[PDB]
Design a protein around this ligand. Structure first.
Ligand SMILES: C[C@@H]1O[C@@H](S[C@@H]2O[C@H](CO)[C@H](O)[C@H](O)[C@H]2O)[C@@H](O)[C@H](O)[C@@H]1O
Ligand SMILES: C[C@@H]1O[C@@H](S[C@@H]2O[C@H](CO)[C@H](O)[C@H](O)[C@H]2O)[C@@H](O)[C@H](O)[C@@H]1O
Ligand SMILES: C[C@@H]1O[C@@H](S[C@@H]2O[C@H](CO)[C@H](O)[C@H](O)[C@H]2O)[C@@H](O)[C@H](O)[C@@H]1O
Ligand SMILES: OC[C@H]1O[C@@H](S)[C@H](O)[C@@H](O)[C@H]1O
Ligand SMILES: [Ca+2]
Ligand SMILES: [Ca+2]
Ligand SMILES: [Ca+2]
Ligand SMILES: [Ca+2]
Ligand SMILES: [Cl-]
Lengths: 121, 121, 121, 121
């Protein structure tokens, strides 16, 4: 398993020690508070009221937690994933990323705390 | 394992099929959007800024997900619990509840989607 | 989890730390060599060529590993059980026992090494 | 998880759907009755009284269940493995094999039934 934090201000994200392999079942739980610029903070689902003006992941809200597995495209994580198997082909290290518009991370603040583990399969 | 929905306006809570037994380890993941009255909605951690006005659980925010286990007090859940063991002498049926003030549930809306599993031991 | 040894010559068997509760999924693995009297030894499946002359479990061979759960009848274990769920209404402490004819355990020798754990469920 | 049979007379063994990856924890349970030639049969630990005449696995008895992982040498399985981690530098598909002398498999009989799964990590 892996525990750690993802900073809202880091366009490169946080690499983990979890290597996702074909067939793996994983569980992720995410918590905490972050902002993409405003004084308000949101949880790991982000801001449901904010439009997409060029986010790295178009399938989650601005301010959400997302990931990449190897050199996949972005995959939504939000509050987490329960006994989840990847939409197929994907493989590699899990990198966690805060969803914002590239070039605009400089006004971001806060972080998410994240646990990941592999399940029975 | 159990999957289901906890309505924000259900004061009595959602009774699950999980009986927490001595020594059990469990994982919970919660998602969704709900409100304790305002037009804005919050995720399962609730609203960090709203003051505690006699919530059923003093150790979680207004609009957070909490639970009881048998005769326990309320216990916080938020976005979830990762490979977690309960307080000494707590056991029995898990009921999931939206954290609000008694008698003030009638203006609530939305729901949280929740999964609960037992882990290896 | 429980890890230990089940002696062939112990008619009362071995009361483990594992309390089987409704819905639990368990794994048991058993290894080793034991005898119900002869100079030869058999593994946890016992002696397939030996007749049943009043065995405590009629559904496994003389010299096999079996168990009781709470106040159940004997249940075959053999080399182990993989992600196993008990029949309805069976619950309580797991006792491991060597399968022999009652009153004939005194000439027995050897033991099985046994691991029991609760699995995800 | 994989469930299947391993024929005692199959010198190439039985390839499974399990790909062992670094960090994986697995469980195996094996059952059944097989022979390397005599009319008598033995369980998955094999025959403790027979000498090694050039077995594919010198670390288990003739008639025992063994395995290979990818390009590995033979590793004992016997009655099974509980929440087991492979040696470092061992990875790839699991193949199950009956322990006999190469070229002498043709007079073998019976089989072992085997379950393999990946466990929480
Ligand atoms: C100035 C500010 O502009 C936006 S918030 C804005 O969001 C983008 C993503 O869409 C980037 O993260 C920027 O860094 C953020 O500042 C308005 O919603 C806000 O009300 C305010 O006017
Ligand atoms: C009228 C309303 O009052 C509160 S919201 C209020 O919160 C309590 C819990 O503290 C109960 O759930 C009520 O049912 C809710 O209406 C203010 O924060 C809000 O701005 C508004 O004035
Ligand atoms: C003829 C037979 O010889 C052996 S059994 C023998 O074992 C080897 C492995 O050591 C091969 O599997 C052969 O296929 C087997 O036949 C004696 O132990 C037996 O009593 C009998 O004389
Ligand atoms: O049938 C069981 C019986 O088998 C014979 S050979 C043993 O000597 C006895 O002690 C008893 O275990
Ligand atoms: Ca920003
Ligand atoms: Ca309310
Ligand atoms: Ca005896
Ligand atoms: Ca042979
Ligand atoms: Cl806080």
């Amino acid at each position: 398993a892996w525990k750690g934090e993802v900073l809202a201000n880091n366009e490169a994200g946080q690499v983990t020690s979890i290597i996702y392999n074909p067939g793996d079942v994983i569980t992720i739980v995410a918590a905490g508070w972050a902002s993409y610029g405003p004084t308000q903070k949101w949880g790991p689902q982000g801001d449901r009221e904010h439009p997409d003006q060029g986010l790295i992941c178009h399938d989650a809200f601005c301010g959400a937690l997302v990931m990449k597995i190897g050199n996949s495209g972005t995959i939504p994580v939000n509050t987490g994933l329960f006994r989840w198997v990847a939409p197929n082909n994907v493989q590699g290290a899990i990198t966690l990323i805060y969803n914002d518009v590239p070039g605009t991370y400089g006004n971001n603040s806060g972080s998410f705390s994240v646990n990941i583990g592999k399940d029975q399969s």
